[PDB]
Each structure stands twice: as structure tokens, then as C-alpha cells.
Amino acid sequence: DVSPCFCVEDETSGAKTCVPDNCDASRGTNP
């Protein structure tokens, strides 16, 4: 479905994680 990605810099994961993960690295950021 149309699912906007969101990234947060998470200290718990130890890095920037996104949903979907690392959408902001690839071109799969926006649907």
C-alpha cells in the first residue's frame, strides 16, 4: 500500500533506522 517512510535516529538500534528500514539510502523512500 501507500506507506510513507519515516526515519529516526535511534540510540537503541544504534543508528538511524527507518520504516521501511534505510528507505533513506535507497530510492524506496516515498511510494
Side-chain angles (χ1 to χ4, degrees):
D1 293 84
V2 177
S3 303
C5 186
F6 198 70
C7 301
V8 187
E9 193 171 294
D10 180 46
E11 302 303 276
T12 308
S13 307
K16 183 187 66 184
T17 186
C18 310
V19 182
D21 189 58
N22 282 329
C23 68
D24 177 64
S26 52
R27 67 180 189 162
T29 321
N30 64 272

mmCIF file of all heavy atoms in Angstrom:
data_model
loop_
_atom_site.group_PDB
_atom_site.id
_atom_site.type_symbol
_atom_site.label_atom_id
_atom_site.label_comp_id
_atom_site.label_asym_id
_atom_site.label_seq_id
_atom_site.Cartn_x
_atom_site.Cartn_y
_atom_site.Cartn_z
ATOM 1 N N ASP A 1 0.847 -1.200 0.000
ATOM 2 C CA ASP A 1 0.000 0.000 0.000
ATOM 3 C C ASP A 1 0.864 1.225 0.000
ATOM 4 O O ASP A 1 2.102 1.127 0.061
ATOM 5 C CB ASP A 1 -0.910 0.050 1.240
ATOM 6 C CG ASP A 1 -1.947 -1.028 1.272
ATOM 7 O OD1 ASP A 1 -1.634 -2.136 1.712
ATOM 8 O OD2 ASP A 1 -3.104 -0.777 0.870
ATOM 9 N N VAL A 2 0.232 2.380 -0.068
ATOM 10 C CA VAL A 2 0.923 3.641 0.034
ATOM 11 C C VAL A 2 1.373 3.819 1.476
ATOM 12 O O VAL A 2 0.561 4.030 2.381
ATOM 13 C CB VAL A 2 0.019 4.832 -0.392
ATOM 14 C CG1 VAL A 2 0.738 6.160 -0.207
ATOM 15 C CG2 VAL A 2 -0.413 4.677 -1.839
ATOM 16 N N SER A 3 2.637 3.665 1.705
ATOM 17 C CA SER A 3 3.164 3.757 3.024
ATOM 18 C C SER A 3 4.393 4.662 3.054
ATOM 19 O O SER A 3 5.467 4.289 2.568
ATOM 20 C CB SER A 3 3.471 2.355 3.540
ATOM 21 O OG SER A 3 2.284 1.553 3.497
ATOM 22 N N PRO A 4 4.212 5.905 3.524
ATOM 23 C CA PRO A 4 5.310 6.858 3.702
ATOM 24 C C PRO A 4 6.356 6.311 4.668
ATOM 25 O O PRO A 4 6.011 5.663 5.681
ATOM 26 C CB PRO A 4 4.626 8.078 4.326
ATOM 27 C CG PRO A 4 3.211 7.967 3.903
ATOM 28 C CD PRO A 4 2.911 6.505 3.884
ATOM 29 N N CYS A 5 7.596 6.561 4.372
ATOM 30 C CA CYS A 5 8.674 6.097 5.189
ATOM 31 C C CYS A 5 9.016 7.134 6.213
ATOM 32 O O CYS A 5 8.865 8.336 5.956
ATOM 33 C CB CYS A 5 9.913 5.843 4.381
ATOM 34 S SG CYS A 5 11.232 5.100 5.387
ATOM 35 N N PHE A 6 9.400 6.712 7.375
ATOM 36 C CA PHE A 6 9.873 7.644 8.344
ATOM 37 C C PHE A 6 11.144 7.106 8.965
ATOM 38 O O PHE A 6 11.252 5.898 9.215
ATOM 39 C CB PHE A 6 8.817 7.939 9.403
ATOM 40 C CG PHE A 6 9.115 9.192 10.157
ATOM 41 C CD1 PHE A 6 9.000 10.410 9.521
ATOM 42 C CD2 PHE A 6 9.515 9.162 11.478
ATOM 43 C CE1 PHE A 6 9.275 11.579 10.176
ATOM 44 C CE2 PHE A 6 9.794 10.336 12.151
ATOM 45 C CZ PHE A 6 9.674 11.549 11.497
ATOM 46 N N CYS A 7 12.109 7.975 9.156
ATOM 47 C CA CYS A 7 13.368 7.610 9.762
ATOM 48 C C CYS A 7 13.563 8.370 11.050
ATOM 49 O O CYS A 7 13.129 9.527 11.179
ATOM 50 C CB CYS A 7 14.536 7.922 8.837
ATOM 51 S SG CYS A 7 14.488 7.100 7.216
ATOM 52 N N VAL A 8 14.193 7.722 11.992
ATOM 53 C CA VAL A 8 14.516 8.301 13.279
ATOM 54 C C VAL A 8 15.920 7.846 13.614
ATOM 55 O O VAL A 8 16.323 6.736 13.222
ATOM 56 C CB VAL A 8 13.563 7.787 14.416
ATOM 57 C CG1 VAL A 8 13.789 8.531 15.728
ATOM 58 C CG2 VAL A 8 12.098 7.837 14.017
ATOM 59 N N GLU A 9 16.664 8.660 14.293
ATOM 60 C CA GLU A 9 17.981 8.275 14.692
ATOM 61 C C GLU A 9 17.838 7.667 16.059
ATOM 62 O O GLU A 9 17.608 8.366 17.055
ATOM 63 C CB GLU A 9 18.930 9.471 14.674
ATOM 64 C CG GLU A 9 20.394 9.091 14.783
ATOM 65 C CD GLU A 9 21.318 10.254 14.537
ATOM 66 O OE1 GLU A 9 21.347 10.771 13.400
ATOM 67 O OE2 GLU A 9 22.069 10.644 15.447
ATOM 68 N N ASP A 10 17.934 6.374 16.108
ATOM 69 C CA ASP A 10 17.614 5.653 17.302
ATOM 70 C C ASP A 10 18.841 5.191 18.017
ATOM 71 O O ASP A 10 19.669 4.465 17.459
ATOM 72 C CB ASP A 10 16.707 4.476 16.977
ATOM 73 C CG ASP A 10 16.336 3.680 18.198
ATOM 74 O OD1 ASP A 10 15.967 4.265 19.220
ATOM 75 O OD2 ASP A 10 16.444 2.457 18.162
ATOM 76 N N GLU A 11 18.959 5.602 19.246
ATOM 77 C CA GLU A 11 20.085 5.244 20.078
ATOM 78 C C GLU A 11 19.992 3.783 20.499
ATOM 79 O O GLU A 11 21.012 3.133 20.748
ATOM 80 C CB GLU A 11 20.163 6.149 21.310
ATOM 81 C CG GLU A 11 20.275 7.629 20.987
ATOM 82 C CD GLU A 11 21.465 7.940 20.124
ATOM 83 O OE1 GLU A 11 22.582 8.105 20.656
ATOM 84 O OE2 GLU A 11 21.316 8.032 18.894
ATOM 85 N N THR A 12 18.776 3.260 20.542
ATOM 86 C CA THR A 12 18.550 1.889 20.931
ATOM 87 C C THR A 12 19.040 0.921 19.831
ATOM 88 O O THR A 12 19.689 -0.083 20.116
ATOM 89 C CB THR A 12 17.062 1.681 21.244
ATOM 90 O OG1 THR A 12 16.659 2.691 22.195
ATOM 91 C CG2 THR A 12 16.810 0.300 21.835
ATOM 92 N N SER A 13 18.763 1.249 18.582
ATOM 93 C CA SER A 13 19.250 0.464 17.468
ATOM 94 C C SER A 13 20.711 0.820 17.198
ATOM 95 O O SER A 13 21.468 0.031 16.644
ATOM 96 C CB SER A 13 18.407 0.730 16.232
ATOM 97 O OG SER A 13 17.025 0.533 16.512
ATOM 98 N N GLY A 14 21.086 2.019 17.601
ATOM 99 C CA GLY A 14 22.453 2.448 17.483
ATOM 100 C C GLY A 14 22.705 3.249 16.241
ATOM 101 O O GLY A 14 23.836 3.669 15.990
ATOM 102 N N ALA A 15 21.652 3.511 15.491
ATOM 103 C CA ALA A 15 21.771 4.213 14.236
ATOM 104 C C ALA A 15 20.412 4.669 13.767
ATOM 105 O O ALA A 15 19.393 4.420 14.435
ATOM 106 C CB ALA A 15 22.407 3.315 13.178
ATOM 107 N N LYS A 16 20.398 5.354 12.653
ATOM 108 C CA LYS A 16 19.184 5.780 12.019
ATOM 109 C C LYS A 16 18.471 4.574 11.458
ATOM 110 O O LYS A 16 19.028 3.823 10.659
ATOM 111 C CB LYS A 16 19.483 6.781 10.898
ATOM 112 C CG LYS A 16 18.241 7.356 10.211
ATOM 113 C CD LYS A 16 18.605 8.218 8.997
ATOM 114 C CE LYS A 16 19.235 7.385 7.880
ATOM 115 N NZ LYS A 16 19.682 8.210 6.744
ATOM 116 N N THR A 17 17.283 4.379 11.877
ATOM 117 C CA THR A 17 16.505 3.311 11.390
ATOM 118 C C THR A 17 15.245 3.901 10.795
ATOM 119 O O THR A 17 14.823 5.014 11.181
ATOM 120 C CB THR A 17 16.205 2.244 12.491
ATOM 121 O OG1 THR A 17 15.524 1.109 11.918
ATOM 122 C CG2 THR A 17 15.371 2.824 13.631
ATOM 123 N N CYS A 18 14.692 3.237 9.840
ATOM 124 C CA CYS A 18 13.533 3.744 9.176
ATOM 125 C C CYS A 18 12.483 2.663 9.105
ATOM 126 O O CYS A 18 12.741 1.508 9.469
ATOM 127 C CB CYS A 18 13.890 4.190 7.751
ATOM 128 S SG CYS A 18 15.331 5.298 7.591
ATOM 129 N N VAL A 19 11.308 3.028 8.673
ATOM 130 C CA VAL A 19 10.243 2.089 8.404
ATOM 131 C C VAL A 19 9.599 2.498 7.072
ATOM 132 O O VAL A 19 8.887 3.519 7.033
ATOM 133 C CB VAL A 19 9.146 2.091 9.522
ATOM 134 C CG1 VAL A 19 8.071 1.062 9.227
ATOM 135 C CG2 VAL A 19 9.743 1.832 10.898
ATOM 136 N N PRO A 20 9.897 1.793 5.932
ATOM 137 C CA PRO A 20 10.861 0.649 5.857
ATOM 138 C C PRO A 20 12.297 1.073 6.128
ATOM 139 O O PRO A 20 12.697 2.209 5.834
ATOM 140 C CB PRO A 20 10.746 0.187 4.412
ATOM 141 C CG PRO A 20 10.258 1.387 3.688
ATOM 142 C CD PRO A 20 9.295 2.049 4.618
ATOM 143 N N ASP A 21 13.076 0.156 6.623
ATOM 144 C CA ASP A 21 14.407 0.479 7.105
ATOM 145 C C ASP A 21 15.353 0.849 5.990
ATOM 146 O O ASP A 21 15.392 0.185 4.943
ATOM 147 C CB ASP A 21 14.986 -0.614 7.986
ATOM 148 C CG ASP A 21 16.261 -0.162 8.655
ATOM 149 O OD1 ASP A 21 16.227 0.858 9.382
ATOM 150 O OD2 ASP A 21 17.313 -0.826 8.493
ATOM 151 N N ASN A 22 16.089 1.936 6.218
ATOM 152 C CA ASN A 22 17.022 2.506 5.272
ATOM 153 C C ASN A 22 16.399 2.862 3.939
ATOM 154 O O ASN A 22 17.067 2.832 2.900
ATOM 155 C CB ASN A 22 18.279 1.666 5.121
ATOM 156 C CG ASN A 22 19.249 1.853 6.275
ATOM 157 O OD1 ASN A 22 19.315 2.932 6.880
ATOM 158 N ND2 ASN A 22 20.004 0.835 6.591
ATOM 159 N N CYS A 23 15.116 3.248 3.976
ATOM 160 C CA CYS A 23 14.421 3.785 2.808
ATOM 161 C C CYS A 23 15.135 5.061 2.358
ATOM 162 O O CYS A 23 15.127 5.436 1.189
ATOM 163 C CB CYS A 23 12.992 4.119 3.205
ATOM 164 S SG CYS A 23 12.891 5.500 4.374
ATOM 165 N N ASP A 24 15.764 5.697 3.316
ATOM 166 C CA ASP A 24 16.545 6.881 3.116
ATOM 167 C C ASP A 24 17.985 6.458 3.008
ATOM 168 O O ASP A 24 18.746 6.477 3.982
ATOM 169 C CB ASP A 24 16.332 7.879 4.265
ATOM 170 C CG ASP A 24 17.172 9.129 4.152
ATOM 171 O OD1 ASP A 24 16.981 9.906 3.195
ATOM 172 O OD2 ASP A 24 17.997 9.396 5.055
ATOM 173 N N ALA A 25 18.278 5.954 1.834
ATOM 174 C CA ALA A 25 19.572 5.416 1.414
ATOM 175 C C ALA A 25 19.393 4.896 0.022
ATOM 176 O O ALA A 25 20.260 5.013 -0.840
ATOM 177 C CB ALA A 25 20.050 4.285 2.328
ATOM 178 N N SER A 26 18.246 4.342 -0.172
ATOM 179 C CA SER A 26 17.804 3.838 -1.431
ATOM 180 C C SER A 26 16.766 4.810 -2.007
ATOM 181 O O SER A 26 16.582 5.908 -1.463
ATOM 182 C CB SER A 26 17.196 2.466 -1.193
ATOM 183 O OG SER A 26 16.211 2.523 -0.171
ATOM 184 N N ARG A 27 16.086 4.435 -3.076
ATOM 185 C CA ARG A 27 15.072 5.310 -3.644
ATOM 186 C C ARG A 27 13.676 4.828 -3.267
ATOM 187 O O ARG A 27 12.670 5.273 -3.821
ATOM 188 C CB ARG A 27 15.215 5.444 -5.161
ATOM 189 C CG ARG A 27 14.939 4.187 -5.966
ATOM 190 C CD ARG A 27 15.124 4.476 -7.432
ATOM 191 N NE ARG A 27 14.672 3.393 -8.303
ATOM 192 C CZ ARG A 27 14.409 3.556 -9.608
ATOM 193 N NH1 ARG A 27 14.616 4.742 -10.186
ATOM 194 N NH2 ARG A 27 13.940 2.545 -10.324
ATOM 195 N N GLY A 28 13.614 3.951 -2.302
ATOM 196 C CA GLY A 28 12.345 3.452 -1.852
ATOM 197 C C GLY A 28 11.875 4.214 -0.641
ATOM 198 O O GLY A 28 11.451 3.619 0.352
ATOM 199 N N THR A 29 11.981 5.524 -0.705
ATOM 200 C CA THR A 29 11.604 6.364 0.391
ATOM 201 C C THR A 29 10.091 6.653 0.323
ATOM 202 O O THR A 29 9.335 6.312 1.246
ATOM 203 C CB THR A 29 12.408 7.681 0.345
ATOM 204 O OG1 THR A 29 13.766 7.391 -0.071
ATOM 205 C CG2 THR A 29 12.460 8.313 1.728
ATOM 206 N N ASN A 30 9.653 7.218 -0.788
ATOM 207 C CA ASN A 30 8.245 7.545 -0.977
ATOM 208 C C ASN A 30 7.609 6.554 -1.941
ATOM 209 O O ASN A 30 8.294 6.048 -2.847
ATOM 210 C CB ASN A 30 8.040 8.997 -1.501
ATOM 211 C CG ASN A 30 8.631 9.255 -2.881
ATOM 212 O OD1 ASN A 30 9.796 9.617 -3.007
ATOM 213 N ND2 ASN A 30 7.850 9.118 -3.912
ATOM 214 N N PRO A 31 6.321 6.223 -1.746
ATOM 215 C CA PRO A 31 5.593 5.336 -2.639
ATOM 216 C C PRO A 31 5.170 6.078 -3.897
ATOM 217 O O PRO A 31 4.198 6.859 -3.837
ATOM 218 C CB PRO A 31 4.350 4.919 -1.826
ATOM 219 C CG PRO A 31 4.542 5.510 -0.469
ATOM 220 C CD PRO A 31 5.467 6.669 -0.642
#
